[PDB]
């Protein structure tokens, strides 16, 4: 299926209309207890996200930073996953070098972003160990995660439907439904999703 | 350009393509970055204790025999995980948790715990809690395979090409206020070296540099170190050491009056180091 998306608030959308997905990915605006130029979700709001209905067997990719290294582990276990891997995106500059300077963390400088990998139930037809748990990529977009993750997930789970939470316009992909409050309207093509969407809204 | 796809095609890990990761070549073209590191390493060297070391079977050792309290503790317990998965005592996370690290840590202090890349990322956090630390950074040792391209835990979904050294903080430290205990942001939370040979269990020596640059406390303990890791400025404790020169009275005397347990700082390093 071509890309599909729903401009919405993730706290409030009835996600049961969306069906089940082999992969769930979220890059949420964690409350990391610092002043930030964007709005965050409280810890309670994050815990209460209705992730568990999105999936019965499959994987979760949950980007984490700061205190959400621990809160994200708590959410992963709350949502019924076992953490089985941890990917890091190593950020390079235009010349494939680490930017070592500035003050980019509280104690040490930060050269990477982390993504917890969780597994739920008993998934079928995935390809283990094709990719490494280190991504090397320059900062390209206003997104805090690299586009390479989409190819890794496809090679892991080819042809299956997948859902992304807190996605932005440039994140829409084939085989993915993208949810976020900055997308352009609603664009649904799967016949079963449109059906339930009409019934619910 | 997608280095993930390139790894799938050729077996060269994406980290193989990061440039200038060595201790020397990273600041070759950045004289004033290199100067900060040079001056700080000189300050470390000027204030370093001579190497001290104690052979001890840590599982059956009363850790309280190590005095005085430590400003930084580096742990490298040989993980039974590693020897089971690949083929002295090997340690489960229950074994590691039983260590009484909190009995020898200074009231303000840091820990650096090598956790591997599997269950240790979660259980190492539990250990930090038990010993009274908060997880505050995660130093990833990213391993290249430039000399040996290709593929290489049953629960894993991806090939594991790094190890995590979790960093924890104990007590109250304030980066702007406590400039006499820490120099924050001098190093980044990544170490990049070539995969060691199978069975070579050494950790990258750069982890010492990160710790020494970061914390000005001079009381530095390396648990599970070896002959090959003894280092000025450090007390090394482990079962495989072939001699022992540790005397707790002598070791403590290096930090008591007229000395300080802190390195202090020069006016030039204060003018060069990153600050708010």
């Amino acid at each position: 299926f071509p890309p599909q998306w729903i401009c919405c608030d993730i706290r409030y959308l009835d996600v049961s209309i969306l069906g089940k997905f082999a992969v769930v990915m979220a890059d949420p605006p964690w409350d990391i207890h610092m002043e930030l130029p964007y709005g965050t979700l409280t810890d309670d709001e994050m815990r209460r996200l209705n992730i568990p209905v999105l999936q019965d067997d499959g994987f979760l990719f949950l980007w984490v930073t700061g205190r959400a290294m621990e809160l994200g582990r708590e959410c992963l276990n709350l949502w019924g996953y076992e953490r089985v891997d941890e990917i890091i995106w190593v950020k390079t500059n235009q010349l494939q070098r680490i930017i070592r300077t500035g003050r980019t963390g509280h104690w040490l400088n930060h050269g990477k972003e982390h993504c917890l990998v969780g597994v739920k139930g008993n998934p079928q037809g995935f390809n283990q160990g094709l990719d490494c748990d280190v991504i090397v990529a320059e900062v390209r977009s206003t997104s805090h995660k690299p586009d390479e993750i989409y190819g890794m997930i496809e090679r892991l789970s080819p042809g299956t439907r997948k859902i992304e939470l807190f996605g932005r316009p440039h994140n829409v992909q084939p085989n993915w439904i993208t949810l976020g409050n900055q997308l352009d309207g609603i664009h649904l093509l799967d016949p079963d999703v449109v059906a339930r969407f009409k019934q619910r809204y | 350009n997608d280095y993930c796809q390139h790894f799938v095609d050729t077996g060269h890990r994406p980290q193989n393509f990061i440039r200038d990761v060595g201790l020397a070549d990273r600041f070759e073209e950045y004289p004033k970055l290199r100067e900060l590191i040079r001056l700080k390493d000189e300050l470390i060297a000027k204030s370093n204790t001579p190497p001290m070391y104690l052979q001890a079977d840590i599982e059956a050792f009363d850790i309280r025999e190590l005095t005085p309290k430590f400003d930084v503790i580096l742990l490298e317990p040989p993980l039974e995980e590693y020897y089971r998965e690949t083929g002295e005592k090997c340690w489960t996370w229950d074994d590691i948790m039983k260590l009484e690290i909190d009995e020898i840590a200074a009231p303000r202090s840091f820990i650096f715990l090598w956790c591997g890349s599997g269950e240790g990322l979660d259980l190492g956090r539990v250990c930090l809690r038990k010993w009274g630390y908060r997880r505050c950074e995660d130093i990833c040792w990213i391993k290249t395979n430039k000399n040996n391209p290709g593929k290489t835990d049953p629960k894993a979904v991806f090939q594991r090409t790094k190890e995590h050294c979790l960093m924890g903080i104990k007590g109250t430290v304030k980066c702007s206020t406590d400039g006499d205990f820490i120099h924050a942001n001098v190093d980044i939370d990544l170490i990049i070296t070539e995969e060691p040979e199978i069975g070579n269990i050494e950790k990258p020596v750069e982890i010492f540099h990160i710790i020494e640059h970061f914390c000005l406390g001079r009381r530095r303990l390396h648990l599970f170190g070896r002959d090959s890791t003894i280092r000025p400025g450090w007390l090394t404790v482990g079962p495989t050491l072939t001699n022992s020169n540790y005397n707790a009275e002598t070791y403590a005397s290096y930090f008591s009056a007229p000395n300080s347990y802190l390195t202090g700082c020069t006016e030039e390093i204060e003018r060069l180091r990153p600050k708010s």
Side-chain angles (χ1 to χ4, degrees), chain B:
Chain B
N1 54 2
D2 183 326
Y3 293 117
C4 299
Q5 180 66 63
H6 194 246
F7 172 73
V8 186
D9 293 338
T10 73
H12 289 262
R13 294 167 183 176
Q15 48 264 49
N16 294 10
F17 298 89
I18 307 168
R19 298 289 299 261
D20 294 331
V21 307
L23 273 309
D25 62 24
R26 70 181 53 165
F27 296 142
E28 215 140 59
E29 321 179 344
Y30 297 103
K32 178 230 163 183
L33 304 187
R34 186 177 73 211
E35 185 63 2
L36 172 61
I37 303 302
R38 187 190 77 83
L39 294 169
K40 273 180 65 58
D41 282 341
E42 174 177 71
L43 172 62
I44 290 152
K46 302 230 217 273
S47 54
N48 265 342
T49 48
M52 261 206 188
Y53 41 86
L54 175 67
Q55 184 282 324
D57 291 310
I58 297 177
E59 68 275 38
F61 176 64
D62 184 358
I63 213 180
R64 298 193 191 41
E65 283 170 33
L66 302 179
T67 53
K69 309 282 189 202
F70 295 96
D71 304 298
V72 295
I73 298 175
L74 174 63
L75 299 98
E76 191 182 316
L79 302 180
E80 175 221 65
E81 177 186 8
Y82 174 85
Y83 293 89
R84 264 213 309 91
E85 204 205 82
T86 73
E88 67 181 304
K89 179 180 179 359
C90 292
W91 291 66
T92 67
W93 281 102
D94 281 340
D95 295 326
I96 298 167
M97 182 132 50
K98 275 198 235 173
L99 299 171
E100 303 186 285
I101 302 303
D102 48 303
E103 297 285 355
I104 59 168
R108 312 185 298 171
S109 62
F110 294 89
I111 192 167
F112 302 83
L113 171 68
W114 284 103
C115 292
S117 211
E119 70 179 353
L121 308 195
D122 314 298
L123 297 180
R125 283 175 157 79
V126 179
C127 289
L128 291 196
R129 296 199 310 248
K130 189 261 194 181
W131 302 324
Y133 300 89
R134 324 182 283 290
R135 195 279 319 150
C136 64
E137 302 293 359
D138 178 350
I139 300 158
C140 280
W141 174 23
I142 293 165
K143 303 174 187 176
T144 58
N145 68 347
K146 292 165 164 186
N147 300 336
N148 178 5
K151 183 174 325 273
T152 200
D153 191 349
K155 273 193 211 43
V157 195
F158 297 99
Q159 278 178 64
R160 293 179 178 168
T161 60
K162 51 172 170 54
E163 293 178 26
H164 298 235
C165 183
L166 292 186
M167 167 194 191
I169 177 174
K170 170 177 289 279
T172 297
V173 187
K174 299 160 221 253
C175 326
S176 167
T177 311
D178 299 332
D180 68 324
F181 194 47
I182 64 166
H183 286 177
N185 311 109
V186 174
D187 285 284
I188 202 168
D189 60 357
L190 306 178
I191 297 168
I192 296 148
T193 72
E194 178 79 3
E195 271 263 17
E197 41 276 28
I198 314 102
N200 180 319
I201 48 139
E202 284 260 305
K203 306 295 184 209
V205 68
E206 180 168 358
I207 190 64
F208 288 121
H209 296 238
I210 294 175
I211 295 164
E212 292 161 359
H213 293 160
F214 170 76
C215 183
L216 313 185
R218 297 172 62 223
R219 307 168 297 174
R220 317 199 185 84
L221 173 65
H222 185 190
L223 286 164
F224 301 100
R226 304 165 297 278
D227 285 21
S228 49
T229 69
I230 71 135
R231 183 173 173 93
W234 286 81
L235 165 59
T236 305
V237 180
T240 73
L241 285 146
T242 62
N243 195 13
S244 299
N245 71 344
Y246 173 70
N247 176 297
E249 181 173 8
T250 307
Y251 184 64
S253 73
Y254 284 125
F255 313 107
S256 59
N259 309 286
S260 177
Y261 75 101
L262 302 166
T263 64
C265 192
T266 65
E267 61 94 7
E268 178 152 25
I269 292 162
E270 288 282 11
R271 270 185 299 101
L272 274 171
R273 74 185 186 86
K275 300 200 192 181
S276 50

Side-chain angles (χ1 to χ4, degrees), chain A residues 70 84-86 97 110 131, chain B residues 20 125 135 137 157 159:
Chain A
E70 289 71 45
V84 291
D85 260 318
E86 181 158 345
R97 291 145 164 91
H110 287 170
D131 282 271
Chain B
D20 294 331
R125 283 175 157 79
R135 195 279 319 150
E137 302 293 359
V157 195
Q159 278 178 64

Side-chain angles (χ1 to χ4, degrees), chain A residues 1-6 18 20-27 54-55 59-63 115 145-179 183 187-190 193, chain B residues 158:
Chain A
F1 307 74
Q4 321 171 237
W5 61 90
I6 309 182
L18 291 202
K20 309 278 163 193
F21 300 88
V23 183
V24 177
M25 191 169 57
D27 188 9
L54 293 181
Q55 209 172 44
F59 300 93
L60 164 76
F61 290 75
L62 185 66
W63 294 87
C115 181
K145 61 133 163 52
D147 282 352
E148 278 84 351
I149 195 69
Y150 295 105
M152 304 171 59
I153 287 174
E154 208 50 41
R155 295 188 284 280
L156 171 60
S157 169
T160 54
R161 54 201 309 264
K162 310 154 176 76
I163 183 170
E164 173 160 15
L165 311 182
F166 310 93
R168 277 153 191 130
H170 59 284
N171 295 129
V172 309
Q173 298 271 329
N175 289 22
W176 287 80
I177 304 180
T178 314
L179 313 189
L183 307 188
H187 186 283
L188 292 196
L189 311 164
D190 193 316
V193 183
Chain B
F158 297 99

Side-chain angles (χ1 to χ4, degrees), chain A residues 18-19 25 35 68 78 106 119 132 160-161 169 175 184 187 197-198:
Chain A
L18 291 202
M25 191 169 57
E35 312 214 39
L78 192 72
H106 300 285
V119 61
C132 310
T160 54
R161 54 201 309 264
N175 289 22
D184 178 51
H187 186 283
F197 184 99
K198 305 250 192 224

